[PDB]
DNA sequence: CACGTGACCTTGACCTCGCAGC
DNA sequence: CTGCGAGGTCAAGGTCACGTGG
């Protein structure tokens, strides 16, 4: 499943990224 | 200690607290109770996840403190492990191990959840390191130090409401690391998946020009043995000595010790495989060295690429590792089966797998660093929070 | 020696001559202009010695410092000569030896030359009124040059990048304790480098004829990448000075560490403070990371000789200390490969104006594995929030650091009581605890205020974002490559 | 009644007439002068009633108040009459015992008569302008008389000895709660005595024909030793008043206690603090001690009727409370024979200027043996260290005492909570502990400064001295008698 | 609280004290120690008169408190019994019963004997009554109350060497009471000595006109018996009832109870003697009454004076009281022997002995009162001492 | 022995008295 | 009887040994 | 093999209650 895995991994990554720009969003404020 | 914003006051933690009861459940021998001990707390999230309900008769000698809704229980035995919890309504009015320090916030001054997040922070526990002993050897502190350690308390008494704001941050934060963990787990499986394609399962027939071959045929093996202990020296006499996996680096073994009279030697470019638990780990030899019995050295004949064999062994590693106690023998290694494509194609696939591996390594390290800085981000959240900076 | 005397005063005069001039904007331009004149005079002197053993021609004879500097020029004709004939002649010597070297040093942008040919002539004659056969005068010029470099360090934020505070240097060199002869290496030597201090010290133990020639020939190996610090530094090491010092414009990271074959007893250094380099350079290292500071750390780790007592004094930022991932790995290796026997937390603004980043002095030893580490936090004067261009770091703060470190050095080899090396400012951290912290070497003072002066959270989330987008780039690279190489 | 204004004023005028007169030195002389005039008028009135009962000869017609007081005298002839033929005539009374009384009253020395016959005539006319057939006018004069007695109480330190503060009286009578008809006894009634207050109370309940007679005849039995208080008191009890009350000039200690006969339902009294009596009198008591107060205590103890509910309110000094020896014995007896249900500590100066001695109100009951005792310390106004002529005791302080005692009376019979009677000035002492203390009944307030305000040592050692040589005298007597009676 | 002279300061007892040790003697099982317990203290003089030396092994559980020279030990169990003592150098560094409060005066502020004399006074113990229990039924107080009760501290602090004055006074005072006691003891035998002169021992020859006679001959006896319990009444029905000596006054018996149906009656002038322990006590009877089994009533016959017999019986009393359990019989009383002078001489000697007895009674009461006021004098000394009045 | 005893008793008494007039002696002072 | 001493009980603190993880 | 924590022992007081001498 090598190729499939990277995909899902990639989705997970840009999801995480989404979460942390929500983090930056709500952290200023400042 | 530091600066304060206009409202906040510095108060000893104790000053904000209520007196707290302790009772003996054996006085009610047939009445059941819920018991909470340090093992019943999840260190990571600071919750009581596993209380045990006990008959009042069978109550342990330590069971004597009454918890109540909003109480913060802070373990006094090694309180750097962050066993600290906020008591739910379900556990109101109940016993927990004396190991704890019970913090009953009087709502006139402090909201309990704020005190929870204060204790949850490295703040109070660093107060505990600063006083008591700095680096003396005792794991525990008395409850009344935990009652004397300064805290900043902010009035109102909304701000404690502010923490309510902190929860938001934290939830998102923890959620991130959850994903990161899963990612990390899965990311490593990539390598094996790639390998799964290149190396066929045994007994399948192979693309043309390849042939199954016994390792002993294309590889010759030097089993290795451990010398007498007089030979060992730090003055760099003879050759470096590697007994087992413990000496392995991530690629090449770091020599820390030498053997003045080597017995079984591994020349560079030999491939080193561990032969005893944990068995099957591989590392490559970058310098002439002497090998113990814990290691076997594999030296590949032409028609075999040291990296082809290496990647193969990496693929085989999970049940190349058996588990009476684990040892592998020259005959065992010689009779393992390996796919043998032409040498040039071997080096081609080796190149390809090499850049896959450099990429996933860079990847690994990257997300590892993100994880670490997520921890640091948390500590930053709390440090910034307990000053007026949000 | 000294005799600064008239001579020091002049040199100062030349500086105000350049202050008046249009083409010298700031102290930066003063020091480089002075540098290129001084260097040419130096080259001429050295060759002249080589006339003396020729008895037993880098450039000649029109272009040697002798003939053109001695002449009394009309100003315009002088300026026209320098720009029109001399710089170009220098630009193109082409001799496979140094001579290429020389161009490399005239290779780029602006050679700083006065706008008024009169001022240029004045500065030139102030320079040729120095007697290079009197080391009193050379000593004087070295002193003035050093002060100019310090002032340059304060005024200009760009240096900054190639400068380090002399108190820091002298301290590091003092603790490392170089002897003759162990090679001394600075894998990035901004300008001068610690090499001058190492020189002067090892010179203070000079003793014998055989030694002096070791000092000037065989003991200084270090290197620099960027042209302006390389040049200014060359001028500084000949000024103090060593007759023909070995240092190269090159990249240390172009080198491949795994083949090593160059090693030194001592490393006293302050590598850059950390940005990306990447790609092809990355492959020169077993651990691969875009971060320059980490690669420099690795390079240093394998640049040391295998013998016991292999030492390094080094300057690191917060980043190298608290960051995980590859850093941890390298740090892990360090701690096991090496005994790291001290860390000195250096307060923010120590390096201002260049940066206010908090830094640490790392003195790590190499008998063996690392057991316990001595931490000395360093006090700011209670007046200041941070060290500044206005109030910089000076040798005194280090006076206290010094005394306590003498204490720790005594205890480490067990010639003294532990109590000597402890003050609320100084504490000792066990290696186990830095390994539970995920190899966070940042200073945490047990007997001290809770506040750990940590960055505002957002900055954290900002960096976190940028390297998350790095992660995305890496993964699409991964899938590009496995979809590319499909049969 | 109380037609004070027209009449009261005059009596006050008469007092100022005596103030002008030479032989009336002070308020003392005023009140006794007024007393003897009033008494004669009283006697005449009573005899007139007895003319009415003659229908169905105390004094010669010439010497009745009627004939000599009505006539308009030249002043000198009046004065000459009173001294020459009247007073000696009244010492001229030999007859039935009662006249012996009349003689008895005058017979003791020196009746107060004005120096100016004019002033005497004026006072006599003011007295003769009182209507004795109006109970209104009698009420008024009684009030003025009472005020005069109070003022006399404040001004004169010798009275003092025959006076007691009316707040104390009213309080004691209120707590004793006399009913009709139980006899009321004051074994020493200085002047008036508590008997007037008891009268007024028991009278506030009469409300039937039978009762009044009981009040006027059978309910007041008490006695007095010294002539002047005896007389002043007689005048007071007729004034308030009971028509012809029974109290005798006699010694209370005259009587033997074993014979007792007597006895009475109630004893409300203030016997003398008192000094020695000794000798013959001592033999009248089972316990024999020279101390008058102790013998009075014994007398009172056996003077009470055997029935349950036999009560005594009484005033005692510190001495009777803290002294041991015979006192303890008597005190023991009291506690065993009697139930003494309360003690009120009365601050120093309550009786001033007579004493300043600390005193206590003792209310002891006779159902049975004594178990628990209620103690009430009484507050001074915090301005004052002690009560004084300037600031005397008044009814209010006792009002608070009253409310708390109501609480205790409720609890004693178990009709109320103990919490009612307790206050930091109120506490309850169990009898066992007073027997452990050697029968020291002195007030010790737990919830108070430990200081017990004991007298200085010297006074203690002084009294100790005098009674030690008293002991020597006793032994001298012992050995004289033991070799005297040798055969 | 008080009013105090310029030097004096009010400080909690505790403030003036040193921290004090407690140790476990069983840790040194073969090492002997001197143990002090409340029984080892003489309450009167406030000294340790009877320590007991114990092996460290046999040490009682109570023995954990260490005493030193100048320490004041103040018992916390019923501290109105004045078990308080000043520790001698011989007992320095030693263990006593935990029921003691150890007061270690730090000589900067307080010298110990003053504190002893403070504790010895009713002052501190009355502070204890003001706090704790007033009336609340428990005999004991914690050490820390005895550490929190106010005391005047008398600096200039060689002003507290006014202790010398106190001791001077006190010893003379105590000495007086000693002598007084002796006087009291001796005074009593006067009576018996007098009686010894008047009554000849049995079998001696007698002055002319006297004759030995059996009591039964000159006296007739009514033995007495106790009625059924219904007869008893407080409403004054029938006659007063006296069961035994307990009902006696010292001369005449005080009636507290009546018998509605009397069985054996004693008229006035009968002489009553107790027939049960204590046997031999006598009281005259002043009123008609009923007698219990504990009493016998002797009615003297004409030849005899009730007071002659009475005084005789006083003389005989000490072993007229013998000591299976002791009771006396009608015959026992009848056959006792009595001297019988003529009636007139009897009444003469009765008069003489009567005035002797009234004199020695007056004497008794006098010296008793002096004693009482010596106690009061002591309390006065201390009360006057602890304010500047000497 | 009756007479002797009062004697001795009397001696104890005048002794006690002496002690207590020395007591008063040293008590003012006061 | 009621006074103390031995005992039991509680609170709070330190010791360390069975147990599961690197 | 090492760190964690729950069971255990231990010391400081504090209250209870029984033996016993006057
Ligand atoms: C902080 S400085 C060194 C300071 C120097 N030791 C001194 O204080 O005199 C960093 C210097 O390293 C040089 N440098 C940066 N990257 C380099 C590389 N890859 N190779 C060699 N030198 C480099 C920079 O030009 C800069 O001058
Ligand atoms: C203090 S007073 C009583 C006060 C009185 N209850 C009143 O109302 O004023 C004592 C009185 O008792 C009188 N007295 C003293 N000795 C006495 C005795 N042996 N018999 C009778 N009365 C006596 C005194 O004359 C004195 O007036």
PDB file of N, CA and C (backbone and C1' of nucleotides) in Angstrom, chain B residues 22 24 27 62 64 138 140 142-143, chain G residues 9-17:
ATOM      1  N   UNK B  22     -10.245  13.984  56.703  1.00  0.00           N
ATOM      2  CA  UNK B  22      -9.857  12.620  56.395  1.00  0.00           C
ATOM      3  C   UNK B  22     -10.651  11.683  57.283  1.00  0.00           C
ATOM      4  N   UNK B  24     -11.830   7.338  58.152  1.00  0.00           N
ATOM      5  CA  UNK B  24     -11.439   5.943  58.099  1.00  0.00           C
ATOM      6  C   UNK B  24     -12.634   5.085  57.700  1.00  0.00           C
ATOM      7  N   UNK B  27     -14.342   2.096  59.750  1.00  0.00           N
ATOM      8  CA  UNK B  27     -15.400   2.475  60.688  1.00  0.00           C
ATOM      9  C   UNK B  27     -16.788   2.182  60.113  1.00  0.00           C
ATOM     10  N   UNK B  62      -3.581   3.272  53.533  1.00  0.00           N
ATOM     11  CA  UNK B  62      -3.408   4.585  52.926  1.00  0.00           C
ATOM     12  C   UNK B  62      -4.710   5.276  52.585  1.00  0.00           C
ATOM     13  N   UNK B  64      -7.443   7.243  53.257  1.00  0.00           N
ATOM     14  CA  UNK B  64      -7.965   8.055  54.324  1.00  0.00           C
ATOM     15  C   UNK B  64      -8.301   9.475  54.021  1.00  0.00           C
ATOM     16  N   UNK B 138      15.626  12.188  47.738  1.00  0.00           N
ATOM     17  CA  UNK B 138      14.286  11.767  48.149  1.00  0.00           C
ATOM     18  C   UNK B 138      13.246  12.149  47.095  1.00  0.00           C
ATOM     19  N   UNK B 140       9.939  12.440  47.474  1.00  0.00           N
ATOM     20  CA  UNK B 140       8.677  13.004  47.952  1.00  0.00           C
ATOM     21  C   UNK B 140       8.820  14.270  48.801  1.00  0.00           C
ATOM     22  N   UNK B 142       6.423  16.965  51.680  1.00  0.00           N
ATOM     23  CA  UNK B 142       5.254  17.015  52.558  1.00  0.00           C
ATOM     24  C   UNK B 142       4.125  17.818  51.908  1.00  0.00           C
ATOM     25  N   UNK B 143       2.895  17.583  52.361  1.00  0.00           N
ATOM     26  CA  UNK B 143       1.733  18.304  51.852  1.00  0.00           C
ATOM     27  C   UNK B 143       1.830  19.804  52.116  1.00  0.00           C
TER      28      UNK B 143
ATOM     29  P    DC G   9      -7.297   0.738  69.047  1.00  0.00           P
ATOM     30  O5'  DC G   9      -7.193   2.271  68.645  1.00  0.00           O
ATOM     31  C5'  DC G   9      -8.027   3.219  69.282  1.00  0.00           C
ATOM     32  C4'  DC G   9      -7.834   4.576  68.650  1.00  0.00           C
ATOM     33  C3'  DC G   9      -7.667   4.539  67.129  1.00  0.00           C
ATOM     34  O3'  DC G   9      -8.560   5.460  66.513  1.00  0.00           O
ATOM     35  C1'  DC G   9      -5.885   5.743  68.138  1.00  0.00           C
ATOM     36  P    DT G  10      -8.518   5.683  64.925  1.00  0.00           P
ATOM     37  O5'  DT G  10      -7.627   6.996  64.766  1.00  0.00           O
ATOM     38  C5'  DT G  10      -8.046   8.208  65.372  1.00  0.00           C
ATOM     39  C4'  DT G  10      -7.111   9.344  65.005  1.00  0.00           C
ATOM     40  C3'  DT G  10      -6.843   9.517  63.511  1.00  0.00           C
ATOM     41  O3'  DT G  10      -6.896  10.893  63.187  1.00  0.00           O
ATOM     42  C1'  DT G  10      -4.807   9.326  64.668  1.00  0.00           C
ATOM     43  P    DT G  11      -7.131  11.366  61.674  1.00  0.00           P
ATOM     44  O5'  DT G  11      -5.841  12.241  61.367  1.00  0.00           O
ATOM     45  C5'  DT G  11      -5.390  13.174  62.320  1.00  0.00           C
ATOM     46  C4'  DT G  11      -3.931  13.499  62.090  1.00  0.00           C
ATOM     47  C3'  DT G  11      -3.517  13.633  60.622  1.00  0.00           C
ATOM     48  O3'  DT G  11      -2.944  14.914  60.424  1.00  0.00           O
ATOM     49  C1'  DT G  11      -1.986  12.268  61.829  1.00  0.00           C
ATOM     50  P    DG G  12      -2.808  15.545  58.956  1.00  0.00           P
ATOM     51  O5'  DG G  12      -1.240  15.720  58.802  1.00  0.00           O
ATOM     52  C5'  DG G  12      -0.443  15.766  59.964  1.00  0.00           C
ATOM     53  C4'  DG G  12       0.858  15.029  59.743  1.00  0.00           C
ATOM     54  C3'  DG G  12       1.382  15.043  58.301  1.00  0.00           C
ATOM     55  O3'  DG G  12       2.658  15.652  58.277  1.00  0.00           O
ATOM     56  C1'  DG G  12       1.589  12.916  59.277  1.00  0.00           C
ATOM     57  P    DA G  13       3.595  15.534  56.980  1.00  0.00           P
ATOM     58  O5'  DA G  13       4.526  14.278  57.292  1.00  0.00           O
ATOM     59  C5'  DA G  13       5.513  14.380  58.310  1.00  0.00           C
ATOM     60  C4'  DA G  13       6.589  13.331  58.126  1.00  0.00           C
ATOM     61  C3'  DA G  13       7.176  13.239  56.714  1.00  0.00           C
ATOM     62  O3'  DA G  13       8.583  13.015  56.795  1.00  0.00           O
ATOM     63  C1'  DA G  13       6.319  11.150  57.351  1.00  0.00           C
ATOM     64  P    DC G  14       9.529  13.195  55.505  1.00  0.00           P
ATOM     65  O5'  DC G  14      10.484  11.920  55.573  1.00  0.00           O
ATOM     66  C5'  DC G  14      10.913  11.432  56.835  1.00  0.00           C
ATOM     67  C4'  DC G  14      10.952   9.914  56.842  1.00  0.00           C
ATOM     68  C3'  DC G  14      11.762   9.280  55.704  1.00  0.00           C
ATOM     69  O3'  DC G  14      12.735   8.395  56.244  1.00  0.00           O
ATOM     70  C1'  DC G  14       9.649   8.238  55.916  1.00  0.00           C
ATOM     71  P    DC G  15      13.783   7.661  55.277  1.00  0.00           P
ATOM     72  O5'  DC G  15      13.185   6.190  55.112  1.00  0.00           O
ATOM     73  C5'  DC G  15      13.092   5.340  56.246  1.00  0.00           C
ATOM     74  C4'  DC G  15      12.729   3.921  55.842  1.00  0.00           C
ATOM     75  C3'  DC G  15      13.564   3.329  54.710  1.00  0.00           C
ATOM     76  O3'  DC G  15      13.888   1.982  55.022  1.00  0.00           O
ATOM     77  C1'  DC G  15      11.267   3.258  54.130  1.00  0.00           C
ATOM     78  P    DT G  16      15.071   1.221  54.249  1.00  0.00           P
ATOM     79  O5'  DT G  16      14.338  -0.057  53.632  1.00  0.00           O
ATOM     80  C5'  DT G  16      12.939  -0.227  53.850  1.00  0.00           C
ATOM     81  C4'  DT G  16      12.294  -1.004  52.716  1.00  0.00           C
ATOM     82  C3'  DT G  16      13.219  -1.339  51.547  1.00  0.00           C
ATOM     83  O3'  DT G  16      12.766  -2.529  50.911  1.00  0.00           O
ATOM     84  C1'  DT G  16      11.473  -0.027  50.766  1.00  0.00           C
ATOM     85  P    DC G  17      13.333  -3.982  51.310  1.00  0.00           P
ATOM     86  O5'  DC G  17      12.163  -4.957  50.819  1.00  0.00           O
ATOM     87  C5'  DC G  17      10.812  -4.621  51.114  1.00  0.00           C
ATOM     88  C4'  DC G  17       9.843  -5.120  50.050  1.00  0.00           C
ATOM     89  C3'  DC G  17      10.384  -6.129  49.049  1.00  0.00           C
ATOM     90  O3'  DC G  17       9.278  -6.832  48.466  1.00  0.00           O
ATOM     91  C1'  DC G  17      10.010  -4.074  47.965  1.00  0.00           C
TER      92       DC G  17
END
